[PDB]
Amino acid sequence: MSRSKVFFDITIGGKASGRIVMELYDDVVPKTAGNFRALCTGENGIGKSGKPLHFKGSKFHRIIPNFMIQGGDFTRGNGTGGESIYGEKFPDENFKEKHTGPGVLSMANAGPNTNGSQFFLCTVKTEWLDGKHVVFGRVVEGLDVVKAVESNGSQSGKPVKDCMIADCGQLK
Ligand code: PRO
Incomplete structure (x- = not known):
């Protein structure tokens, strides 16, 4: 079973800013990786929210310099929302991987x-x-x-x- 590869094409103020490519740890946290993968492809359609289970067209709603960029609230766009493919919330799968530097997802x-x-x-x-x-x-x-x-x-x-x-979406 290989790790999934997914991408975001980003715009900033409407301008094309390039592509972020991410490798997911399907082997370590399959459920969590699987959620994110499906949210990149949009393959589970419309959520309980009545909105697409899809990151396409959503924003990074919370961005803190020298810390992190945060997004995925495609129901309310402000950090109060969001929906996993499983339903509103799911448990912490494990804490095996650590926050070791820039680029951690x-x-x-x-x-x-x-x-x-x-x-x-x-x-x-x-x-x-x-x-x-x-x-x-x-x-x-x-x-x-x-x-x-x-x-x-x-x-x-x-x-x-x-x-x-x-x-x-998902690559390869
Ligand atoms: O938004 C925050 O500040 C915390 C730290 C990253 C995820 N939640």
């Missing part, structure tokens, strides 16, 4: 066992999140695109302009 949450569709891409090592957020992949191409998004964040977390997942 990990699940956002509201406390233990509240995984939905929100995720973050780290721009630094964030070891204080180890054991609290489930790490399920890594950037393998486009870290510069992550940095471009990061430059539009604020300490407050509010973006200075819309950083959108203009397209997404």
Whole structure:
């Protein structure tokens, strides 16, 4: 069983900013990887929310310099929403992988066992999140695109302009 590869094509203020390619750890956290993979392809259609279970057209709603970029709220666009393919929330699968540096892909949450569709891409090592957020992949191409998004964040977390997942999907 091979690791999944998925991508985001990003726009910033409407402008094409390049592609982020991510490898998922299907071998370590199959359920969590599987959720994200299906959210990139959109293959499970319309969610309980009545909105597509799909990152396409969603934004990075929370961006903090020297920390991480966060998105996946395709129901409310503000961090209050999101939906996993399994339903509103699913448990923390395991904490085997750690937040070891820039490019780590990990699940956002509201406390233990509240995984939905929100995720973050780290721009630094964030070891204080180890054991609290489930790490399920890594950037393998486009870290510069992550940095471009990061430059539009604020300490407050509010973006200075819309950083959108203009397209997404699974590769190979
Ligand atoms: O949004 C935040 O600040 C925390 C840290 C990353 C995921 N949740």
